[PDB]
Amino acid sequence: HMRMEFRHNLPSSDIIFGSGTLEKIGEETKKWGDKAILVTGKSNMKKLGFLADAIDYLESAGVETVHYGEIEPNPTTTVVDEGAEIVLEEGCDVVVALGGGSSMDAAKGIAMVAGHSAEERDISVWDFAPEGDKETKPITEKTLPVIAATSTSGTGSHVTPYAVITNPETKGKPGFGNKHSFPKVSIVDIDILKEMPPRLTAITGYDVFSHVSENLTAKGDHPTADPLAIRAIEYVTEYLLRAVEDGEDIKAREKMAVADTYAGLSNTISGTTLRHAMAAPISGYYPDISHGQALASISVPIMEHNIENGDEKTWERYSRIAVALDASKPVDNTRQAASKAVDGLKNLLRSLDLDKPLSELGVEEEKIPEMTEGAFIYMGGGIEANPVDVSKEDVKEIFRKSL
Amino acid sequence: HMRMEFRHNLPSSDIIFGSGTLEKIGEETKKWGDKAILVTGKSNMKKLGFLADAIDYLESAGVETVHYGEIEPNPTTTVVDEGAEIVLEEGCDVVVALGGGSSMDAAKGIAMVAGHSAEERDISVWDFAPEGDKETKPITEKTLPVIAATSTSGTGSHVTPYAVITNPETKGKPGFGNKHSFPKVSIVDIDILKEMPPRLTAITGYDVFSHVSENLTAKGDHPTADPLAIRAIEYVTEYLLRAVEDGEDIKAREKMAVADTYAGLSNTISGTTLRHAMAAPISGYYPDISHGQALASISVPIMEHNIENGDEKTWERYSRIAVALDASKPVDNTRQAASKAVDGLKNLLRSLDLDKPLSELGVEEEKIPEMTEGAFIYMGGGIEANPVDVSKEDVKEIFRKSL
Ligand SMILES: NC(=O)C1=CN([C@@H]2O[C@H](COP(=O)(O)OP(=O)(O)OC[C@H]3O[C@@H](n4cnc5c(N)ncnc54)[C@H](OP(=O)(O)O)[C@@H]3O)[C@@H](O)[C@H]2O)C=CC1
Ligand SMILES: NC(=O)C1=CN([C@@H]2O[C@H](COP(=O)(O)OP(=O)(O)OC[C@H]3O[C@@H](n4cnc5c(N)ncnc54)[C@H](OP(=O)(O)O)[C@@H]3O)[C@@H](O)[C@H]2O)C=CC1
Numbered sequence: 001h002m003r004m005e006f007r008h009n010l011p012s013s014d015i016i017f018g019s020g021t022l023e024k025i026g027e028e029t030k031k032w033g034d035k036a037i038l039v040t041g042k043s044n045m046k047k048l049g050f051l052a053d054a055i056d057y058l059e060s061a062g063v064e065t066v067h068y069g070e071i072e073p074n075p076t077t078t079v080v081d082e083g084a085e086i087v088l089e090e091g092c093d094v095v096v097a098l099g100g101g102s103s104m105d106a107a108k109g110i111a112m113v114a115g116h117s118a119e120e121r122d123i124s125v126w127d128f129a130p131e132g133d134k135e136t137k138p139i140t141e142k143t144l145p146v147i148a149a150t151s152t153s154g155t156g157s158h159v160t161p162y163a164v165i166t167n168p169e170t171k172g173k174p175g176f177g178n179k180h181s182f183p184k185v186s187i188v189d190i191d192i193l194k195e196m197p198p199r200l201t202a203i204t205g206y207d208v209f210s211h212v213s214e215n216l217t218a219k220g221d222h223p224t225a226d227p228l229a230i231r232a233i234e235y236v237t238e239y240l241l242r243a244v245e246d247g248e249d250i251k252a253r254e255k256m257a258v259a260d261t262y263a264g265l266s267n268t269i270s271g272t273t274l275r276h277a278m279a280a281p282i283s284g285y286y287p288d289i290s291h292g293q294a295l296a297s298i299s300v301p302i303m304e305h306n307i308e309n310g311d312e313k314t315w316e317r318y319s320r321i322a323v324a325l326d327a328s329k330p331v332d333n334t335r336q337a338a339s340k341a342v343d344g345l346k347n348l349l350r351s352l353d354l355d356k357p358l359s360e361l362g363v364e365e366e367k368i369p370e371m372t373e374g375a376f377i378y379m380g381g382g383i384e385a386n387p388v389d390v391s392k393e394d395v396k397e398i399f400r401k402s403l
Numbered sequence: 404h405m406r407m408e409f410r411h412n413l414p415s416s417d418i419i420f421g422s423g424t425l426e427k428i429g430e431e432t433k434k435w436g437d438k439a440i441l442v443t444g445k446s447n448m449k450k451l452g453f454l455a456d457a458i459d460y461l462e463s464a465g466v467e468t469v470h471y472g473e474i475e476p477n478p479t480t481t482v483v484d485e486g487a488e489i490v491l492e493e494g495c496d497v498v499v500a501l502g503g504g505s506s507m508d509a510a511k512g513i514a515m516v517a518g519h520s521a522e523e524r525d526i527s528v529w530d531f532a533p534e535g536d537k538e539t540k541p542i543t544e545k546t547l548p549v550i551a552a553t554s555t556s557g558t559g560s561h562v563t564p565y566a567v568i569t570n571p572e573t574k575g576k577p578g579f580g581n582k583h584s585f586p587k588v589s590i591v592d593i594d595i596l597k598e599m600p601p602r603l604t605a606i607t608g609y610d611v612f613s614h615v616s617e618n619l620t621a622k623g624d625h626p627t628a629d630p631l632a633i634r635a636i637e638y639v640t641e642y643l644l645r646a647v648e649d650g651e652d653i654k655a656r657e658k659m660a661v662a663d664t665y666a667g668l669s670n671t672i673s674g675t676t677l678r679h680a681m682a683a684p685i686s687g688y689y690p691d692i693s694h695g696q697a698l699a700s701i702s703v704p705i706m707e708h709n710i711e712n713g714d715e716k717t718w719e720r721y722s723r724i725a726v727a728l729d730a731s732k733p734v735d736n737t738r739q740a741a742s743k744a745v746d747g748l749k750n751l752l753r754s755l756d757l758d759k760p761l762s763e764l765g766v767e768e769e770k771i772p773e774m775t776e777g778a779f780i781y782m783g784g785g786i787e788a789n790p791v792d793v794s795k796e797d798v799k800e801i802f803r804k805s806l
């Protein structure tokens with residue numbers, strides 16, 4: 001018998017879940033600081049009224065608030081570093097996020113820079129970012145505390161340590177974070193999430209499924225993540241399409257928000273693999289491409305490559321995914337049982353209108369070698385976590401099949 | 404549709420899992436202090452050699468160590484308070500546990516007292532303990548850091564905040580703890596656990612099942628605990644009897660240790676209910692009765708009372724328990740589907756030789772009113788968490804049926 005070995009690490013988590021829990025954002029933020037920077041996107045929280053409510057709750061709690069409404073999707077180093085300058089200039093002592101993964105990550109990045117800085121700055125978020133064997137800047141308890149109110153049932157970021165930040169000079173899109181950038185308090189408000197439009201619901205929903213399916217197949221044992229990851233896939237298969245077709249189906253929104261929370265906790269304990277490592281350089285080189293659409297367009301080839309080069313332990317993991325996708329009845333540990341995960345995946349992608357080759361997104365074949373370099377330079381951990389080896393030419397070939 | 408509302412709170416967790424991970428206890432403990440009190444029982448870790456190894460690893464890591472080998476099962480206030488006096492007298496700055504729930508809880512209690520004390524003491528662990536509406540002493544970050552190496556696949560205590568301490572003057576056996584008494588590092592060593600004898604394996608195994616089955620039926624929503632709790636029941640039904648009948652079946656030991664870890668995390672997020680509230684005063688008044696045997700002997704009547712006074716949401720939870728126990732195929736939300744959990748429970752208890760009326764343990768009918776008082780004075784939270792009301796006379800009647 002093969003013995004089981006692992007180390008589980010999960011930072012403290014405080015999750016306020018329900019509809020109308022945006023109410024709490026002020027009382028909770030005051031516990032951590034008197035002056036917040038409020039990090040958001042440019043239009044939807046404002047248009048939907050939740051920006052005004054957050055500001056109200058924060059001020060009413062006695063938290064003086066500076067609004068930073070500049071996060072565009074796929075946040076950049078420049079936008080983080082400029083928001084950190086504001087934190088230093090205004091004296092903010094806590095970073096509050098109201099938005100999706102792009103806002104929550106930008107917020108964590110701002111907390112990092114501003115917390116480690118001198119008076120005017122002298123450090124960039126990129127100093128914390130992996131890049132080849134570059135020795136990163138340690139991320140320490142100096143990181144400012146982060147309060148995260150998510151608006152998508154998409155990234156898990158309200159309960160992960162990670163920020164995903166793009167450098168436009170290199171096109172890299174790495175993740176980074178640890179226990180000191182995990183949000184102190186996490187607010188999941190169904191009244192905010194249920195306003196996602198159908199397309200956003202489907203994209204962020206697929207992100208949930210992508211996290212947990214990679215978390216389960218990542219190399220080594222990780223049994224504390226696995227039941228959360230499995231249940232999330234069951235919730236995706238049962239509720240995601242319900243949420244897309246009726247945004248006001250509240251049960252379905254609640255299950256996708258629980259599923260998204262599972263995914264963040266599961267992705268903290270375990271980690272993502274090749275699909276994430278390759279989707280980063282796609283949105284890195286093509287910033288108008290949504291993260292989840294990038295994941296979708298390369299999923300089939302990657303799952304097929306991992307199954308073709310796998311072993312019985314990895315095949316059994318893919319067979320549990322197939323079962324959770326309703327693509328099969330019995331779990332088994334063979335190449336063929338595992339291959340049903342590809343059928344269930346295709347079904348999922350079709351029901352969500354996410355099955356698009358990279359061509360239909362605007363990716364061009366000439367970019368392959370650059371994007372392959374991107375994947376190894378900036379997502380080396382995910383390549384290492386993948387259950388089967390890949391060479392630089394494996395990844396080139398995978399990109400071409402996804403075109 | 405009934406909206407979903409909850410707050411999830413889980414302290415930081417660091418779990419080192421494998422066989423031979425006792426190796427790590429010194430390096431890990433040194434991160435938190437230079438001088439440990441090592442809290443253990445009186446004979447088995449010593450006899451089995453693990454006491455000598457721990458001391459070796461601690462000293463070899465440069466952690467000067469004072470051994471406190473005085474924890475008897477069902478630890479008392481007196482034993483905690485005397486161990487705290489040693490911590491103060493010797494200057495210890497970190498508390499290390501090597502043992503079962505009794506040692507781990509005693510350790511947490513010692514960390515509490517010694518951390519909040521003046522020079523010689525002036526405070527008892529009982530000051531932190533619930534007791535009616537007595538205003539407890541707040542448990543704060545002054546609590547000393549705790550390193551927990553468990554030796555039973557039984558209590559979850561290596562990953563809960565709680566200490567369960569008996570006051571022999573009152574016979575109360577409450578639990579108490581929060582984020583500041585959650586172990587900083589948790590070591591699960593299969594080489595230690597696989598030495599549990601058959602009877603201890605079965606008793607502590609039933610404790611795992613008791614935690615997660617109450618965690619799942621506790622009042623309100625708690626979806627982040629539920630998948631861990633479910634998987635634990637699946638592991639109990641599939642491996643516990645294997646572990647009892649062959650202590651050297653390592654796969655089975657590993658699954659019960661994962662199940663026990665699930666239970667601790669699940670019991671931190673959610674909570675136990677009436678079965679635990681009533682089993683406390685049994686071991687409180689009869690300290691030679693094992694916690695898990697006490698739980699076993701009152702389970703059938705309690706499950707029947709909760710099912711008889713339940714609703715469809717609680718019935719559905721019991722039906723999932725029945726399915727996880729292999730007592731039934733389809734989950735359903737009726738009184739009858741739920742009642743199959745009682746059949747699966749009876750099967751479990753019989754396969755483990757735990758189905759004994761309280762009489763066969765030495766409990767006497769004359770004690771009922773005292774034990775009922777015990778349950779409300781000292782386990783009020785669990786009564787409140789139970790999915791159906793109970794009066795003081797409900798609990799008296801339940802005790803009599805279990806006799
Ligand atoms: N663990 C981590 O740190 C992870 C990070 N990521 C990263 O997360 C980002 C995720 O972005 P994601 O959350 O998917 O979406 P984004 O945060 O990037 O932006 C979402 C878009 O949808 C709009 N929007 C957001 N919420 C709502 C809503 N409730 N109703 C209407 N419109 C809304 C936003 O409006 P506006 O423009 O007004 O904000 C914005 O235009 C990516 O950069 C990805 O790399 C992905 C996975 C995990
Ligand atoms: N979250 C919490 O804080 C919880 C706490 N509890 C409490 O936990 C305690 C649990 O006790 P539990 O862990 O069940 O058992 P105990 O720690 O009470 O003692 C176990 C007995 O078995 C012996 N022993 C322990 N490990 C081994 C081993 N690996 N091989 C051989 N002998 C062994 C001990 O030897 P020795 O005498 O040498 O130590 C002792 O005699 C109870 O007081 C209960 O109330 C219960 C559930 C949850």
Ligand SMILES: [Mn+2]
Pocket residue numbers: 155207210211276291
């Ligand atoms: Mn993702």
Ligand SMILES: [Mn+2]
Pocket residue numbers: 558610613614679694
């Ligand atoms: Mn118990």
